Amino acid sequence: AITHMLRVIVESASNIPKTKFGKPDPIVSVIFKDEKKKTKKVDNELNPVWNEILEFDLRGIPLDFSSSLGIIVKDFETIGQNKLIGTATVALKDLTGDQSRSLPYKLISLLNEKGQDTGATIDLVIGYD
Numbered sequence: 001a002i003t004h005m006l007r008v009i010v011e012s013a014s015n016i017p018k019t020k021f022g023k024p025d026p027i028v029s030v031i032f033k034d035e036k037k038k039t040k041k042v043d044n045e046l047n048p049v050w051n052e053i054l055e056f057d058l059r060g061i062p063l064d065f066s067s068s069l070g071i072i073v074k075d076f077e078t079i080g081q082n083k084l085i086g087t088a089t090v091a092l093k094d095l096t097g098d099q100s101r102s103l104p105y106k107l108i109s110l111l112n113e114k115g116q117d118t119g120a121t122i123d124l125v126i127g128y129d
């Protein structure tokens, strides 16, 4: 039996909210089935670009109707815990089946801790290897 991987390209984000002083330093956490991989941070940027590629071992478990990807965008803090900008959960059901394909996932709204749209978005490309 062959190994399959979920491929996530973190492309960019837009309209990250301004901070009172200085500028936010965005960094994205990508979580698939509790495995977390991060991007690099981008310094002092409201519209960051990464073009970073992450791949997760599916470990023989196929994608199904309920499969999803978690995204958390935070503002890097050198001292202690980074600051939340927003989250998204992305439905992966369009990748189900045995056909390798990639799809764009554009203008994904990032939601704050109250679940409100922040006006910021992230763009991904996600594929089934």
Ligand SMILES: [Sr+2]
Pocket (backbone or CB within 6 Å): 022, 023, 024, 025, 043, 044
């Ligand atoms: Sr900064």
Ligand SMILES: [Sr+2]
Pocket (backbone or CB within 6 Å): 023, 024, 025, 075, 076, 077, 078
């Ligand atoms: Sr910061």
